[PDB]
Write a structure and sequence with these properties.
alpha+beta; Ricin (A subunit), domain 1; Ricin (A Subunit), domain 2; two-stranded antiparallel ribbon; 8 helices; 38% helix; binds formycin-5'-monophosphate
Length: 246
Amino acid sequence: DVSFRLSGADPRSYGMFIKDLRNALPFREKVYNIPLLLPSVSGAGRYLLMHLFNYDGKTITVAVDVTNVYIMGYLADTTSYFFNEPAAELASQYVFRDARRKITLPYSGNYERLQIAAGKPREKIPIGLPALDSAISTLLHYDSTAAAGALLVLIQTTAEAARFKYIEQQIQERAYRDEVPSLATISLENSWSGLSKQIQLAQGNNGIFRTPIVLVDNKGNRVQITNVTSKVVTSNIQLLLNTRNI
Ligand SMILES: Nc1ncnc2c([C@@H]3O[C@H](COP(=O)(O)O)[C@@H](O)[C@H]3O)n[nH]c12
């Protein structure tokens, strides 16, 4: 289990939590020195528990699938809450057995469905470490409209920051003040599968991508990643989704 406490959190304890989250996910190989996540794990071993504490010290436990860093559900007090999708139901068999009741949230956990349920696209929700504290407080009391907005903050400040060093840095700049994500952060989030696939297929193709990944950058718009010497590959992406899961 990894843990993060927002009381007394600053940019470096947060980097320390994201470091431990990354280091808790099992891998067999490194492709171009990036951890390649396993095709499948079976049993309860497939799930990582993160214990998150807000400013006041209340907590929620979040369950993450270690093969893809996908947030499946969470436990708040005695109630477990799971996304309405097949993998989250499978997950409810291994985690939070101890809950007095299990509620299925009325949406799956992908971004389109959560934005629709929240009433705001990601681009309009301030993220940062104050927003994470808020999100933990919202998840402690069931409301599905407000839980969709809090889960969008929760995915990006934990799972997306683990996947990309650039997003982790974005959240460390937002440690005492929230701010909506840059288009670059949204671009990166959406490209993890694509980028993971091409870095994998680039082995045996001299580090060259079969098809270029296009991202918008930290100045404005439209950028094509064609090979593994790009800084996106050498410095930014931190975990790769196994091609068997794409
Ligand atoms: N519940 C969740 N927990 C973690 N990551 C995600 C995602 C991420 O959203 C990204 C973009 O998804 P789509 O390609 O389905 O739009 C993917 O990298 C996926 O892993 N959506 N929902 C998530």
